[PDB]
Every structure is written in structure tokens, then in C-alpha cells.
Design a protein around this ligand. Structure first.
Ligand SMILES: Cc1cc2nc3c(=O)[nH]c(=O)nc-3n(C[C@H](O)[C@H](O)[C@H](O)COP(=O)(O)OP(=O)(O)OC[C@H]3O[C@@H](n4cnc5c(N)ncnc54)[C@H](O)[C@@H]3O)c2cc1C
Ligand SMILES: CC1(C)c2[nH]c3ccccc3c2C[C@@]23CN4CCC[C@]4(C[C@@H]12)C(=O)N3
Ligand SMILES: CC1(C)c2[nH]c3ccccc3c2C[C@@]23CN4CCC[C@]4(C[C@@H]12)C(=O)N3
Ligand SMILES: [Cl-]
Ligand SMILES: [Zn+2]
Length: 664
């Protein structure tokens, strides 16, 4: 495919603003339609996942318009994604070769637990991801992912309007056949707002909860909540002076301690690129995905930046998520002039390992515009008590949120977006096919399971978050209890069976394993014990012993009961096949390598000889995965065979759940 420069030239020829060049790619045109079946408020990641999945689940059935107030895809925190999200991208026609041009490779998850009272001591818990011929995970710059999903939506019959705001004072939402009148303006100052007549409104406005807040006050859980503060840093090519043994930058790394934890995410940034040029690059990448261009014949990230006139750099996202019962010194002016900067730098010097870690990184100023060197957000976790009603439903953050830890926000939250998308088809058809009272009653009953799932989802994630946080107060409990249980209960089994038709049904059974009974039994024992010890104290050694022994006793039975075959010892560095902790164990599968030229992390597979990021040819041998323990040639062939293409939809197959086998 020869690259085209359609949008770059259109924007120049017409002197078009950012919102105007984006909206010119809409199937029905750059102006709003007078009527739609579905109007989605917000084109964050979930509003777009919703619209893409709805159209892909049943094409040419619903007219869908997405309304987004940002003039172009905006900055968002929330960069780490999991196999379920990649699989969803692949089911929607974009596999790893194309996604790695845009996003950073993520291998596994790694945790380092810092002893507070013995500064310099730490332990770790280390996992790997998957072979390159199986799948990938991704570190995503959110303005780029939202651009990707906007362009893909427009190419699949969805209209997306940037620079437009839903007016929630004058919008009318009700249970009729076509009961909704969604008022859309360019802002509060706008004298000439438009109206979209429509059947279904989807609140995808995130934590702002712009519609469902009108239906119930925000709900907070008992006890402490969290605050976060974060910034963007350089990404060293040479990671060897990082003070943690065996550190690798293509994991989502977690630095954990009694007060909370630090995320570390290496990812490429496209900031500084004109939006029209980016549209041309994304469009070209989708055309290459359609044509099946092999990864070695696809331009590298840096080559795309040259071709389309873009800016490209490697950055590290680094932030704290700490409890809000931390006591800070009255005066933090020695650590900076703003609160976020102050608390960030103050926490860094409280742990010698964090200070030694951060000394490998240089702060980037205002990566996302003026005032964005530092971010702070307070009181993270909440739930919306009402997530649907006559003429509307809510998805994603607008339903509730807990914490960045284990990335439930995107990866678990897409269970709501994709289930809502599937349910939108009968919701709209019910309204077109029955009188008003019976339609409203039948839609309400259809959505009882959706409401009940959301009601139970956020509390289960909140208990999962507290479980991990309390265990992070000790360097044995963190890795040997909390991390262990999260991976045993939450690795999504039988993901290779998922397809577009079953995706929502599978996704709502996952919940990172936070519904697994044995997981909840261990979580409650730890939370109950540890919450009685003031944060400023060290856990008594006997409490750690008792909790460790209780966790292991519950673990043995639950592991024996799981009928799922998995090389646990190759995926979890510290554990054997039966999930017993092994004190010195260091062996693991090796799926990735670092480019010697640019520092980017790459997947090992025989058909990718060149770095996808800078294009530097690596030598043929380095392409080989290391399986420890070994796999035969046949076993390796069998594994790869299960991951080429997803199964066609069979309406008689029983769905295999992602969670461990019940004991019966
Ligand atoms: C510190 C922190 C770290 C996190 N890390 C991770 C992580 O590593 N991985 C992960 O999966 N999740 C993470 N999360 C959670 C994640 O950021 C969210 O779950 C996710 O961004 C939710 O997306 P959304 O589409 O629901 O809402 P958003 O992305 O917030 O989008 C809402 C959209 O609505 C628009 N909008 C608002 N009002 C209107 C209106 N009136 N009209 C039109 N548009 C409107 C906004 O412009 C915005 O684009 C993190 C959260 C925090 C706080
Ligand atoms: C199941 C899987 C999708 C998965 N889901 C996770 C969720 C959270 C954290 C880690 C994972 C993983 C790692 C796995 C384990 N499987 C071993 C054989 C194939 C596969 C697929 C993949 C693999 O190579 N890596
Ligand atoms: C299990 C079932 C009651 C169900 N439970 C859900 C929960 C959330 C979202 C969707 C579902 C569904 C739809 C299902 C999926 N199964 C495929 C084979 C038989 C069956 C039973 C039925 C079917 O035909 N439709
Ligand atoms: Cl994660
Ligand atoms: Zn390179």
C-alpha cells in the first residue's frame, strides 16, 4: 500500500481546526445528524470500545454517534493493558505487528517489595507474558489509542464528533420509542446548540458521571481511600544501573511498600505531532493491517514518524498510588512548589531504593502541554449506585472505579462496555417494536443482570485492592500471598476460545479472579488482621507467619482442584509447577529482548528479524524464545497452533470460564 496524505493535505487546503479535520472522516459527514439510534457521551477508551463492539457485534443495525468535548483525543492516565484487551483488538482486526508500531510492548508484571524498617532490603515477584507467536500486551499512550479507535470506528460506520459537548441541563432522556433529545453544543458559550433525536443514551463520561450522577449520589467505600500523583520521565536505553536485580523495563513494574506503590511503565509518546498527520499515519497502518503486510515489511515507528511528519520519543510513566491516611509533614516546600511535585519528591526520599531507582530517570517538562509536568488526583475509588434507566445506560468509569493496581480500569471495565454494546441491539429493537409501557418494562428486565453485575463488581475490586495493599506492608506477604493469589485466581483461562460473539460473556466472568471464593477467604483473613495494626507500625512477625500459613493451607486444596494445565513454573519466576514458593528460584521463559540500537523491547519470533521501533536488523539467532522448562518442537508447535485465529461462533459450545475449576 502506497502511503496517502489525505488528511494532512485536506487540513492545509482548508485551514481546518483539529476538530474539523477529525470530524471530516465521519461516514455521515462533519456536521451532527438530526437522528441516531445511539448517542454516546464521551469518546474516551470505553465510549469507543462500546461503539466499535456494538457495530462489530451486529453490523449495519444501529446508527451510533459519539460526542466528545476534547478537540482532539486528550491526555488520560491509564496506560497498562492485559491479554484480554489485546485479544479484543485482534478480534477487531489489528494484531501485534501493527499495534507495536503505535504502542509499547508489555511482557509481564513485576513487583518489588521494599522493607520500610530495613532500608535497602527488598523482595520481588516476577511474571512473564507470552511468546510473540501467542499474543502481546501493550503500554498505550491514551491520545494515540483514542485516535486509533476513532479512525477505526469511522471506518466501520460510526460517527465520532470531537469538539462537541453534551449539554446535560437541556438534554432530555426518557423511556420512549425515540424518546431522547440529546442537546449537543460546542460549549456553554454556544448560542446555537443542536439536538440529536435518538433511542438510547450511553453515559461514557468517565469519573465525571455527567448523567448518572443525576440519578444517584456518588458512593464511597468504608475506610481509607487512595490518592495518586505522577509525572513523565525519560526512558533509559541502559537499564543496568536500576537497583533491582533482574529488572526489565517492558514489564509493568510495581514498587511496593506499606503506604502504597509506584507504577513504572515504558511507552512511546507521539506528543507534538499534528493531528491530521497522525490520522494519515493511523489510516496507513489500518490499510496495512487490512492487506496483511508482514511485520518485517512494515515501516518501523521511527520510519512512520519520518514518512508522516510526526514526533516520536520514548518516555516512562511513573506515579504513586498511596493511602489517604498517610501523615505528611506540614511544610513540604523543600520538595517543590506544587502539591503533586511536593508529595512525589517527598515520598521518593523516604525510601533509599526509590531514590536510587529514580536517579536513573530525568524529568520531562510539560509533556502534554503547559501545567502537565505533574498530576495529582485525590480519593480515587467510588461507585455509581444507578447505571441504567429508561433511555440510558452507563459504562466504564461512569459505573465506578477503584485503583490503577492490576489495571482493572480498562481491562476489567471493558466487560461493561462490551456487554452494554451487545445489549444495545435488543434495547433499540424492543423500543421500535412494542408500545411504550411494555417496551420500558421489557428493557428494564433485560438490564437487571447488567445492573446487578455492576453493583457487585466495584465492591469485589475494592476488596481485591485492599487485599494487595495490606500485604504490601510486608516483604513476604506481598509476593507469596497477594501476588500469588491474584495470578492463580485471575489468569484468564481459555482466552484462546474467545470470539466477538462470546467476548462480553467471557469478560464478565473474569473480574481478575476477585470473585473466586478461596481468593476472598484469604483476602478477608489478611484484611481483618492487618487493618488492626496502625500504618506507622511494622507488622508483627507472628502475624505474618500466621497469615502465610493460612494462605498456603487454602492454596494447596484450590490448586489441586484446578483442572487447567499451565506451566506455572515458567510464568512465575519464584514458584514451581504446583505454585509452591521456591526460595532461590530464578528460572523463567524468555519471550523478549532489548534492541541494542534504540533500547525498545521486542518480541522474539522467527519472522520478525528487525526492530519494529527503529528498524535495526537483529541477528537471526536472537529471535529464539527460551522455554524453561524445555518444550519439544511439537509442544511449541501445538501452543502456537492454538493462537493463530479465534474460533468461529458455535451457538452450542459451552463457554469455558477464565477462573479456576470449582472443587465440587
Ligand atoms: C492514577 C491512575 C492510574 C491508572 N492506571 C491505569 C492502568 O495502568 N491501566 C488501566 O487499565 N486503567 C488505569 N486507570 C483507570 C483508567 O484511567 C480509567 O479506567 C479509564 O481511563 C476510563 O476511561 P473512560 O472511557 O471510562 O473515561 P475517560 O477516559 O475519563 O473518558 C471520559 C470522556 O468523557 C468526555 N466528556 C466528559 N463530559 C463530557 C460531555 N458533557 N460531552 C462530551 N464528552 C464529555 C471527556 O472529555 C473524556 O474524554 C488509572 C486511573 C488512575 C486515576
Ligand atoms: C493465559 C494468558 C492469556 C495469560 N493471561 C494472563 C492474565 C494476567 C497475567 C498473565 C496472563 C497470561 C500469560 C499466558 C499464560 N499462557 C500459557 C500458555 C499460553 C499463555 C497465554 C497467556 C502464555 O503464553 N502466557
Ligand atoms: C448461559 C446463558 C444463560 C447466558 N448467561 C449469560 C450471562 C451474561 C451474558 C450472556 C449470557 C448467556 C447467553 C447464553 C450463552 N449460552 C451459549 C450456549 C447456551 C447459552 C445459555 C445462555 C445461550 O444460548 N445463550
Ligand atoms: Cl497491570
Ligand atoms: Zn530499535
Amino acid at each position: 500500500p502506497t502511503p496517502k496524505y489525505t488528511f494532512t493535505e485536506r487540513a492545509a487546503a482548508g485551514n481546518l481546526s483539529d476538530a474539523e479535520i477529525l470530524n471530516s472522516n465521519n461516514p455521515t459527514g462533519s456536521e451532527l445528524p438530526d437522528e441516531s439510534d445511539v448517542v454516546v457521551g464521551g469518546a474516551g477508551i470505553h465510549g469507543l470500545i462500546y461503539a466499535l463492539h456494538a457495530s462489530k457485534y451486529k453490523p449495519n443495525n444501529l446508527k451510533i454517534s459519539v460526542i466528545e468535548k476534547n478537540t482532539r483525543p486528550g491526555y488520560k492516565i491509564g496506560e497498562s493493558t492485559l491479554p484480554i484487551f489485546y485479544t479484543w483488538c485482534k478480534l477487531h482486526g489489528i494484531s501485534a505487528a501493527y499495534l507495536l508500531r503505535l504502542f509499547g510492548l508489555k511482557d509481564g508484571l513485576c513487583f518489588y517489595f521494599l522493607d520500610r524498617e530495613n532500608q535497602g532490603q527488598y523482595t520481588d515477584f516476577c511474571s512473564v507474558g507470552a511468546p510473540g507467536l501467542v499474543l502481546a500486551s501493550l503500554q498505550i499512550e491514551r491520545p494515540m489509542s483514542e485516535l486509533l479507535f476513532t479512525i477505526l470506528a469511522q471506518r466501520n460506520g460510526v460517527n465520532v464528533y470531537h469538539g462537541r459537548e453534551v449539554d446535560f441541563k437541556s438534554t432530555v432522556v426518557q423511556g420512549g420509542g425515540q424518546g431522547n433529545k440529546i442537546a449537543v453544543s460546542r460549549g456553554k458559550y454556544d448560542s446555537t446548540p443542536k439536538t440529536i433525536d435518538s433511542a438510547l443514551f450511553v453515559d461514557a463520561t468517565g469519573r465525571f458521571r455527567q448523567f448518572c450522577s443525576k440519578k444517584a449520589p456518588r458512593h464511597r467505600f468504608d475506610g481509607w481511600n487512595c490518592n495518586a500523583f505522577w509525572g513523565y520521565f525519560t526512558a533509559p536505553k541502559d537499564e543496568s544501573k536500576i537497583p533491582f536485580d533482574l529488572y526489565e523495563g517492558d514489564h509493568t513494574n510495581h514498587l511496593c511498600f506499606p503506604e502504597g506503590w509506584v507504577w513504572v511503565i515504558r511507552l512511546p509518546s507521539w506528543e507534538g505531532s499534528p493531528i491530521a498527520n497522525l490520522m494519515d499515519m493511523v489510516t496507513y497502518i489500518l490499510e496495512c493491517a487490512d492487506a496483511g503486510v508482514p511485520g518485517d515489511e512494515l515501516p518501523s515507528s521511527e520510519e512512520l514518524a519520518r514518512m508522516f511528519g510526526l514526533k516520536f520519543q520514548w518516555v516512562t510513566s511513573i506515579g504513586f498510588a498511596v493511602r489517604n491516611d498517610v501523615k505528611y509533614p506540614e511544610d513540604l516546600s523543600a520538595y517543590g512548589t506544587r502539591e503533586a511535585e511536593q508529595k512525589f519528591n517527598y515520598f521518593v526520599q523516604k525510601y533509599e531504593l526509590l531514590q536510587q531507582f529514580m536517579s536513573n530517570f530525568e524529568l520531562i517538562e510539560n509533556l502534554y502541554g503547559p501545567g502537565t509536568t505533574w498530576f495529582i488526583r485525590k480519593t480515587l475509588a467510588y461507585q455509581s449506585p444507578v447505571v441504567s434507566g429508561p433511555g440510558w445506560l452507563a459504562i466504564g468509569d461512569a459505573c465506578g472505579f477503584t485503583n490503577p493496581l492490576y489495571s482493572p480500569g480498562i481491562n476489567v471495565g471493558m466487560s461493561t462496555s462490551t456487554w452494554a454494546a451487545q445489549l444495545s441491539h435488543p434495547i433499540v429493537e424492543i423500543g421500535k417494536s412494542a408500545p411504550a409501557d411494555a417496551a420500558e418494562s421489557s428493557i428494564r428486565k433485560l438490564l437487571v443482570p447488567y445492573d446487578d453485575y455492576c453493583k457487585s463488581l466495584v465492591p469485589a475490586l475494592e476488596q481485591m485492592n485492599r487485599f494487595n495493599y495490606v500485604c504490601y506492608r510486608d516483604t513476604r506477604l506481598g509476593p507469596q500471598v497477594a501476588c500469588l493469589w491474584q495470578f492463580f485466581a485471575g489468569i484468564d483461562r481459555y482466552l484462546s476460545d474467545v470470539n466477538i460473539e462470546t467476548f462480553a460473556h467471557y469478560a464478565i466472568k473474569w473480574v481478575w479472579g476477585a470473585m473466586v471464593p478461596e481468593y476472598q477467604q484469604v483476602a478477608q483473613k489478611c484484611i481483618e488482621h492487618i487493618e488492626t495494626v496502625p500504618l506507622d507500625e511494622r507488622l508483627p512477625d507472628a502475624m505474618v507467619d500466621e497469615l502465610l500459613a493460612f494462605s498456603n493451607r487454602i492454596k494447596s486444596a484450590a490448586v489441586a482442584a484446578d483442572d487447567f494445565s499451565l506451566r506455572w513454573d515458567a510464568i512465575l519466576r519464584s514458584f514451581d509447577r504446583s505454585l509452591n514458593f521456591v526460595e532461590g528460584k530464578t528460572s523463567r521463559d524468555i519471550y523478549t529482548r532489548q534492541c541494542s540500537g534504540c533500547g525498545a523491547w521486542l518480541q522474539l519470533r522467527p519472522d520478525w528479524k528487525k526492530c519494529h521501533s527503529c528498524g535495526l536488523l537483529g541477528t537471526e539467532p536472537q529471535t529464539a524464545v527460551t522455554f524453561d522448562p524445555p518444550l519439544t518442537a511439537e509442544e511449541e508447535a501445538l501452543l502456537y497452533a492454538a493462537w493463530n485465529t479465534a474460533p468461529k461462533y458455535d451457538p452450542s459450545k459451552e463457554l469455558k470460564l477464565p477462573t479456576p475449576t470449582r472443587p465440587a
